[PDB]
Amino acid sequence: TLRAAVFDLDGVLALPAVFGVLGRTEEALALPRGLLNDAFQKGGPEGATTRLMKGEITLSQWIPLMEENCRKCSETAKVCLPKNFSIKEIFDKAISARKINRPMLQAALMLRKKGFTTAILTNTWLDDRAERDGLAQLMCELKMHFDFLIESCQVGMVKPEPQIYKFLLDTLKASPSEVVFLDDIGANLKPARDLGMVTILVQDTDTALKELEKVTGIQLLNTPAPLPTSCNPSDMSHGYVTVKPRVRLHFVELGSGPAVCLCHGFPESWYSWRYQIPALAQAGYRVLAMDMKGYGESSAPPEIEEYCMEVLCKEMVTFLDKLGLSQAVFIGHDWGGMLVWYMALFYPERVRAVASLNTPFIPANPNMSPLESVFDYQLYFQEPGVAEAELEQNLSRTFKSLFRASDESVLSMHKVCEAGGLFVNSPEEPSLSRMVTEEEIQFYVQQFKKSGFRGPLNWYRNMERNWKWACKSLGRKILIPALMVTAEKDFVLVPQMSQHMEDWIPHLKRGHIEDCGHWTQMDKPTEVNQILIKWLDSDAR
């Protein structure tokens, strides 16, 4: 009974195999067959390549030794090499060309989802090339997905020596019989086999995946498309900034590059962006996913006025000031989308680009106060303590009833004042949505235990204030790069409401997601990530 899966990197987790390039290179150059491959292996265990894989010498140190061997091995067949021949040029190109083999990673990912323990066991080098970052990026992305990564240069052992196999077993804490070993090399494969581990010779991925599926008894092939990578809160970098005495802002930080600020809606978390954080960071961005004022680890002052857009936008600018950021790409959903449109109208200097999910930008009416105005829920929210008491009564019930996809029984926003509550027609025990796990629901429950629903509800209690402030921007235009994303089945933030936006945002780029409800991020994470990344790459450098 297997409980562990082990993958080689080259020719297994990453493709094309860098190894394969020696063959490609000799035949591209009209060079005698295996001359290059034999130069690589010169001296075998006492050889330059083994010293490299053992961590005795670095990659840049090894290059000259390999070139030398290329000449010594040439003497045998008496041939001469090209003038421009460069080992560095070759591996730089080979390393660069090498990518993650996605079907293989998905297979390793499924096994881990099923309680398997996974590892990467590779014969590798200490890369000190000026171009080493590319491999470092690939290595970072690969793992985060595995329980262990064992590199020969770090452990001082190589394949095929038996000590490495015994080392792998000790790390795994598994008897060989409960382990699958995947390698594209027969030699590196035998030690594991004659130790009793299950082995797969990897030639082609489908055929290798066919063998793995059969061995583990798990559907690995032709499986439906998986969800993007989520976030485990305990594994994140948590940031804390005091924007003013008694008001501190919490955020989650991941990745390097241009700053992308994520602003959630009501009643959410930085955790609403769980599917977005790894993808955008992987896309070459520095993600800062906020806990907006009143939520989670951010401060929740009792006062209503602390939640007007002018005060909220001001603190976001202070947040940038204190973080030492001249700009950030502002991305908001729901109430975050509202804030983000205001950041663009009032502070274009600090905003690289603006993106809104579901929330439309609508210019304020100078002749009518919004309080003049059945999207009844806003009226229900005005009274302090009323909506708080109902929403805080049973938190598990609150989130399960709120967080529902388009096909689920969503819950009405009309005549709620007449009904006397948001959940007055709702079951005591709501069913669990396809969007969330019980564990994910429980995160929100623990987050909302700190401050409750007062601060979040206060976001709705500044209608007249936000309206007066908005009237000042009535003559302005959004001329900075902007993206408006609509959700088909959002019945509060309807795509129709966004139709006249070009009157104020002429260069506006758009996105639309079908069969998507209000909770856009967890509804359609894959579509959201595709739209946002595409837009960031073209408009937000």
Next chain:
Amino acid sequence: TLRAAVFDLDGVLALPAVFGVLGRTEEALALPRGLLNDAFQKGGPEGATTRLMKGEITLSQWIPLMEENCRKCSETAKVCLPKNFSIKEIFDKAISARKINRPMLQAALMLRKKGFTTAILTNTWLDDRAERDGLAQLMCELKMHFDFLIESCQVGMVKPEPQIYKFLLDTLKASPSEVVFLDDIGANLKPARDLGMVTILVQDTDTALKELEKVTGIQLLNTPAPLPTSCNPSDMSHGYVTVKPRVRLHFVELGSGPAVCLCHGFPESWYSWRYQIPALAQAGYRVLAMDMKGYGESSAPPEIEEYCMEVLCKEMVTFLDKLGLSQAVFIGHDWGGMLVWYMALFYPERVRAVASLNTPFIPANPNMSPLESVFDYQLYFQEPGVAEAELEQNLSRTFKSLFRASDESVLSMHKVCEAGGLFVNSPEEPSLSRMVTEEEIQFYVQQFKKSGFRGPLNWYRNMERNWKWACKSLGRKILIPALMVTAEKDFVLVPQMSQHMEDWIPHLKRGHIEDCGHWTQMDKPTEVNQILIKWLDSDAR
């Protein structure tokens, strides 16, 4: 009696005045005098420029209006304009060319150091140009230095209207008689004057500074060179990463750009880099100043083995992994310098560049254990509880005795075992060093109250372990960009000890600081910042 100083930005805090460019442009083009200046002012209060300064319209919106006025104002003198004439081209160039007027900022900085309340009062615009970042950077850098920044476009008022002057006074909470007002415009100056505030017409800086010096009775001119900007802990972004259960790492984060990891020595803080953080962030870098394992807000496990270089380097890599960083420029001082050399030897993939202050890189001796070996202090540190008890006895006394510059009475590192203590020859009440304030000393005192000196002292108790691990790197070379910085008067980490480094680090770049003791960062902050930035710009992109 003055207690407040107010500066205009254009022609006062920033130079050349963007205003000045209209004159430069008309005479460069052989254009009638004041044609451009008069096009700018067309309609005065009801004019396009006033609407811009009031925040009614954005900068990109205003450009077309200004071009239009340039044509209408041309009709008067009947002249024709160049084909390539561009208002955008003009202000883009003018805004870009405009810099902070350093002597003026230094003057504003001195007044604030003396208990003055300072502010910036400028007539400005909402910049939505694709090139707005430059101004946003200048604006961010300028302030951080002032109590208030009042922009006309944000407040809806302009100069010369009296409401702005009354607004400034309300923010300041000052009677006009206790305020100095500096403007390069006579018109913007009169309202403040006839309200009774002290006024300076700014033409040239020395002459304007002469007037300010006379008025406030403070030496502003020809004053000695000031210290770089320090850090106020309450104003920083604090980051927290769990690298493993029970071990969390704390850091301070400032700026955008390539990641620069700062690793302090013994017994220090992230606060040891206080002078470096703002300067490097301003230099275009993302600074991460660590609280190394055992210090401040980082975890301090009791176990000795947790402090060996192999475990410490591993956690730093995990820290990068969790932050989503493929690489970071590693900069260390003292024990941080030791760690940083090891990060390069063992993980070149994760290190963009390596920099060490005072700490030399010395290859381990395979034929001799370091424990075989009067730098007595190491021997004094081996015994658990002994050095802890002495160092923890009086924290204020510990830091004041430790943190001493070259001319101060430094304190011996020899025969300390024979003496029976580090401070056995030291006064009960040490004098306060020129390097630190009593307030800065007290920060270290509060930081060391959490974990004590055990974890930090454990860094010294892994000699044999670090030696065995180092022996594995004996055949390796540091071929990644490296900087070695020496301090003349460091008597523990002597510059002589670094002399053979090129044998292992051929491409090594160097730095040297004279009359500098062991506590390099606070000893010579200006020299340190100059060396590090220079090196980062050339070697660390």
